[PDB]
Amino acid sequence: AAELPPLVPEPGDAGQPFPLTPTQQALWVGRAGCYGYFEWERPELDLARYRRAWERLVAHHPGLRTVVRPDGTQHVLERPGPVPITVEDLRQDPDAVRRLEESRLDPGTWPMFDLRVVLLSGRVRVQLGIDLQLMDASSLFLNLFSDLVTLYDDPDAALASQKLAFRDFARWLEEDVRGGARWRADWAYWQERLDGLPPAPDLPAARKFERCMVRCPAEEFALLRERALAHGLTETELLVGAFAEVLRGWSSDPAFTLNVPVFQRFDVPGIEDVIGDYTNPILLEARPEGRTVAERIVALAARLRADTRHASVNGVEVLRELARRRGLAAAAMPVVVTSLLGLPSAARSITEFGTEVHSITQTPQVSLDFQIRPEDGELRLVWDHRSGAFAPGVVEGAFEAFLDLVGRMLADEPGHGVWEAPFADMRSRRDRAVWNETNDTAEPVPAVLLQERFFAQARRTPDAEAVVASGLRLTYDELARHAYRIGNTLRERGVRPGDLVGVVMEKGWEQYAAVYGILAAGGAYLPIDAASPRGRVARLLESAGAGIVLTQSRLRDELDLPAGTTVLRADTDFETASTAPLTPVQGPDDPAYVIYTGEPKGVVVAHRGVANLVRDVRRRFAVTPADRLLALSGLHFDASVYDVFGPLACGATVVVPPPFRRAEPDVWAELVRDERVTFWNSVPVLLELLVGEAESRDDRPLATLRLAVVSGDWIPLDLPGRARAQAPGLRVVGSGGPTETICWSLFHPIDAVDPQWTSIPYGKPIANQRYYIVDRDLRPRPTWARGEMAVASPLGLALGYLNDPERTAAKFVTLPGTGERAYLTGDFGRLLPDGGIEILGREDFQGQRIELGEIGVRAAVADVVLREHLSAELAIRLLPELPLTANGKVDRLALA
Ligand SMILES: C[C@](N)(CO)C(=O)OP(=O)(O)OC[C@H]1O[C@@H](n2cnc3c(N)ncnc32)[C@H](O)[C@@H]1O
Ligand SMILES: [Cl-]
Ligand SMILES: [Cl-]
Ligand SMILES: [Cl-]
Ligand SMILES: [Cl-]
Ligand SMILES: [Cl-]
Ligand SMILES: [Cl-]
């Protein structure tokens, strides 16, 4: 070690100033609330006897007489006044319980505290206010309350000799001890860590103090200690370590720092009788070190003791140097564990004086304060948390978790049970009920093929308008026939079961026949865009191993393809064919399509899953054959798979639009007006453009819309209402999911946009899908907790990535929870308390921008669409229009 200078007690300079301690100084600058409070009920109080005791206390303890000179220093007083106790009298008052309800200071003015007595009929309520600057947690419980009990019992009773008054101790640490033997070798320890220190726990926010607590009885207190010992741990070390596990539950990162203050008086003779601020924040580093709870708790506990062996540097100095190194705001420690365990047994317990009825330490720059403190043989576990520091339920839920962790520790002999269990599930009972309830989406998908359902309908209603395309219409029978024509032809050219027939073409009726024939032939269509570069279209086909290519006659020659790949037009090269039905040869778990998306990978998608989506949307939004869908997404965009297999499988009418490149909302408002369209499906920016052009027209062109499904990007906050403007009765619905999740994998009826939402929600999960939110260990999190979205399903997930079975084996994992095969979407979100998911973006944590902007795009790893208004209500680069991507959406990569 390195011995510390002796304390030099000079009882003469008591009045003359001494400087503020570091803990206290940091408070005396935050004021420009902060004041603890207690309240004990007792049957009958003797104010006379009471008042004397409080005069004695003030007489005796110079700390109850110290004031803060406005110069920043503090001096004792000697003739302070008389103690101001304030009696309120509410005994014959009915609604005494009302006037008593309404309840709740300066170091320049003398009483740093606040005495009160309220006289209800038959019982009395002593109310002690007190200031967080005037003394500390241990001075309060071991000196102030211990003597207030003695002094109330006998105001004249014997009181200890006040050797070496606190002004020296402060003048000692500030001058004599700071700088020397131990302190130099301890400022090394922290300076050699302030770069490895993780930030404070990052819990969920929701963009006064409240209190959960429990009383561990004597019999359970003993066991709690025995359990901590069996691991070579002190109760405070077991509980810090449990509290550390519970926090990782919600924490937005597993490594964080806990302000764990020690109340060390440095073994000084007589000091354990002087009232003052012995507070030293230790910055404990919580990194998870260990495979089990014991292993991690034991490990962290060690780093706490090393952080303790080097205490003579006051944390307020570490906290200040941490702000030097980093930001200031990136250095607060608003999660603290305040343990009074292992201090000396105080003469008297405040419980003797009266039973508590209230108390709330209103610390400043503290959102959560876990207080471990013993009272009359019991351990009082207490969580004072600044209300609204945390999203709803987060703290109340973590307390449930914590109580259960501790619960198990008392239940589980060490080395068994929870102690050697790799993690603990922190999701509360509600967390789980609501998640199961919400994700009980299991429904048999009958093994009917996709084409065999459309055929089935064309024989059911053959006069029906199947496709309507470029004026040139198409009945179900005619489209069924031409598919057969195409189906049979291909199978004759040997399109064996499972082969991939590219459908390289531009928006036309010929696409609906090309797909439904490739399926009947026994294959699986590979859409590629007929607007990609001349070298890309052939590149995707060679990489996928696709021979036959169905195409339109126009721009057949504009297709530099090899000879080993046959090419048929589909508006002509097919008409002398057999309109006689093909017999399905493929199974329902075989591929219906391969849609393509740093290198580009291709998504194999089976029949069953598409079959599942289709017959849910239809049951979700009664899809009658009356409905007429404007099939606007491209066939190489995942968004199309409903337009292909949705309406036709039940009797409705696809309504192809005029091929486009730049979004042409003039034409669409027309085609929607003309063909009486009732079903809109596309990315939100296109259904916005369409609402733009529709609002600026005397007619009601979009008025036949009964249903609009925006998905695939950010559905803007105003958009559900601007559309719901035109055509009252339109029901809006937003969606999404990766192209690896078969078009739409979850739905959120947008009936009513909350103003204070950063984003529209994402959804509840559709049929046969489950949306988990997992930590980095693929474990479900509790509500509000930030995670990656793992979409679990046997029939709702893509089969895999076309050829590469590594990016498949990596992104389609087996969740350790349950065995469910699930897709790691690489999108981050958090569960909501109605069961929904909020979508936070994807690897965007360096993100709520349009949060500020709308109340205009986001930043980048800023762009709006006019003053120097940075932080307007808290590099901007305005732009006329924001740049769309290929399919719509908002091209965040092009922006920087
Ligand atoms: C499947 C689809 N939603 C269209 O229905 C889609 O976008 O296909 P994808 O873009 O090729 O698939 C991968 C990614 O899609 C992103 N995404 C879809 N919807 C989103 C919403 N509403 N908000 C944010 N991102 C969204 C995913 O993030 C996914 O990796
Ligand atoms: Cl009350
Ligand atoms: Cl040590
Ligand atoms: Cl050490
Ligand atoms: Cl709250
Ligand atoms: Cl609205
Ligand atoms: Cl895109």
TrEMBL record:
One of the record's GO cellular component terms: cytoplasm
GO-annotated biological processes: amino acid activation for nonribosomal peptide biosynthetic process; antibiotic biosynthetic process; lipid biosynthetic process; secondary metabolite biosynthetic process
Similarity section: Belongs to the ATP-dependent AMP-binding enzyme family. MbtB subfamily.
Pfam families (UniProt xref): AMP-binding, AMP-binding_C, Condensation, PP-binding
Entry-linked CDD domains: Cyc_NRPS
Cofactor: pantetheine 4'-phosphate
Entry keyword annotation includes Nucleotide-binding: yes
Protein name: Phenyloxazoline synthase MbtB
Binding site for AMP: G712, D713, S735, T739, D827
Pathway listed: Siderophore biosynthesis; mycobactin biosynthesis
InterPro entries assigned to the protein according to its UniProt record, in alphabetical order: AA_adenyl_dom, ACP-like_sf, AMP-bd_C, AMP-bd_C_sf, AMP-binding, AMP-binding_CS, AMP-dep_synth/lig_dom, CAT-like_dom_sf
UniProt keyword list: Ligase, Nucleotide-binding, Phosphopantetheine, Phosphoprotein
Any one GO molecular function term: ligase activity
Gene3D superfamilies reported for this sequence: 3.30.300.30, 3.40.50.980, ACP-like, Chloramphenicol acetyltransferase-like domain, Luciferase, Domain 3, Nonribosomal peptide synthetase, condensation domain
